Amino acid sequence: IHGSLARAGKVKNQTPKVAKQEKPKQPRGRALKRLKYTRRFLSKTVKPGEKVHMNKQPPGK
Amino acid sequence: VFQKKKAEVCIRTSQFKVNKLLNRKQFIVEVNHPHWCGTVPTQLIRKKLATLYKVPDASQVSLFGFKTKFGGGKTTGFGLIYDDLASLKRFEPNYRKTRMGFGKARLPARKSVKERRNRNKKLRGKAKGK
C-alpha cells in the first residue's frame, strides 16, 4: 500500500526548522485604514487598461 | 485666553414646591461652578442655600442626589429644606440624618439577628435570650 501507521509525522520532521525574522510594529486601528488608503488611492495612480497587481513577487524559475 | 479667577458657585432652583404635610419646602437645585477643581461638596451648597432662602440655620437644609453634568461646570440635585430643625430630626431617614450628623447608631449584623431568632424558636419561654 506504500503507507503505514509508523510513517506519521514524516514531512513534519523532514521540513528543517527556520526562525522568524524580527519586525517592528505596524499601526493599529484607524491608522491602518488610513495608511492602506493612501497606498490604495494616493501612493500611485490608476492607468486605464491596466490592472493593479496587489502583491507581485520577484521573478524566479 | 485663560486668566486666574477665584472659584465661584451659582445656585438656582427649579420647580419650587410648598407642602404642609412634612413641614418642608422642596425644589431642585442646579450648581454653576465654571472654575472649580473637582465637584462642589454639599456642605458649601448648604451654606449658600441657607443664605439664599434666609433660614436661621444651615442644618435644616437637606441636600442629596447631586449628579454632575457631563463636560464639567455644572451639577444638579434635589433638595428640601424644613421649616424647623426639630421637624428635620423628626422627618428624616437614618442615612440622610447620619450624613448630616444626627443619624442613629447602626444596628448589629442582620445575620446575627436572623440566627438569634432560630435559636430561640427551638426553646421554651424564658430560656430564650435570658
Binding site: 486601528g29 484607524r30 485604514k33 488610513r34 492602506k36 488608503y37 493612501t38 490604495r40 488611492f41 | 485666553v1 485663560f2 465654571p34 457631563f70 463636560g71 464639567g72 461646570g73
Partner: protein
C-alpha cells in the same frame, strides 16, 4: 432575571463577504471620511435602510391618508432638521434618493473638518475624542454626533479645553512641573 431594558442592533454584515467593487468602495469611504473600521459604514447603511423602508410604505398610501399625512410630515422634519435633505425638496419622494455620503456629511467629525476647525478629517476625530469641541456649550466626545442645521453655528472649542478659555493642556503642564522640581 427580571431585567427590562432593550438592547437592539444597529448594523449588519454584507451578504457577499468578498466583493472587489464593494471592498474598494468601502475603503474609499474609510480614508475619505476617517473611520476606524467598516462597522460605521454598516451602521450608516442600516440607518439609511430604515428610512427607505418606511418611506417606501408611505408612498403607497394616498396623500390624504392620516398615517401618510402624519408620518410623512414627521419624516420630513427629521430629514430637514438633521440636514439630510435640502429644505426646498419638500416632496416625500426625495427621501427615497438619500445616499450614504449624505449621512456621513452630517457627522461631527465631518462637520468639524469642513468648518475649518480641523485641517484633516483624522484631526477632527482625535480632536473630538480629546474633549476639545463643545456643541451649544456642551462637550461632545463622539465622532458620530449627527448635528442639526440649527446647531451648526454653535460649533466651537470647549471653554475648558486648552485651545480657548480653559487651563493649559498636558504638555504645557507636565514640563512646567519638571522645571519647578529641578529648582
Amino acid at each position: 432575571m427580571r431585567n427590562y431594558n432593550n438592547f437592539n442592533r444597529v448594523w449588519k454584515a454584507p451578504r457577499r463577504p468578498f466583493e472587489k467593487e464593494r471592498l474598494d468602495r468601502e475603503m474609499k469611504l474609510c480614508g475619505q471620511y476617517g473611520l476606524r473600521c467598516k462597522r460605521e459604514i454598516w451602521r450608516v447603511n442600516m440607518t439609511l435602510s430604515k428610512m427607505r423602508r418606511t418611506a417606501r410604505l408611505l408612498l403607497t398610501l394616498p396623500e390624504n391618508h392620516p398615517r401618510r399625512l402624519l408620518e410623512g410630515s414627521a419624516i420630513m422634519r427629521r430629514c430637514h432638521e438633521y440636514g439630510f435633505l435640502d429644505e426646498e425638496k419638500d416632496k416625500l419622494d426625495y427621501v427615497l434618493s438619500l445616499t450614504v455620503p449624505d449621512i456621513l456629511e452630517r457627522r461631527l467629525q465631518t462637520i468639524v473638518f469642513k468648518a475649518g476647525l480641523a485641517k484633516s478629517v483624522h484631526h477632527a476625530r482625535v480632536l473630538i475624542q480629546q474633549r476639545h469641541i463643545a456643541v451649544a456649550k456642551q462637550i461632545v466626545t463622539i465622532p458620530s454626533f449627527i448635528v442639526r442645521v440649527s446647531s451648526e453655528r454653535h460649533i466651537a472649542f470647549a471653554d475648558a479645553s486648552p485651545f480657548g478659555n480653559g487651563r493649559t493642556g498636558r504638555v504645557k503642564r507636565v514640563r512646567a512641573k519638571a522645571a519647578k522640581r529641578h529648582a
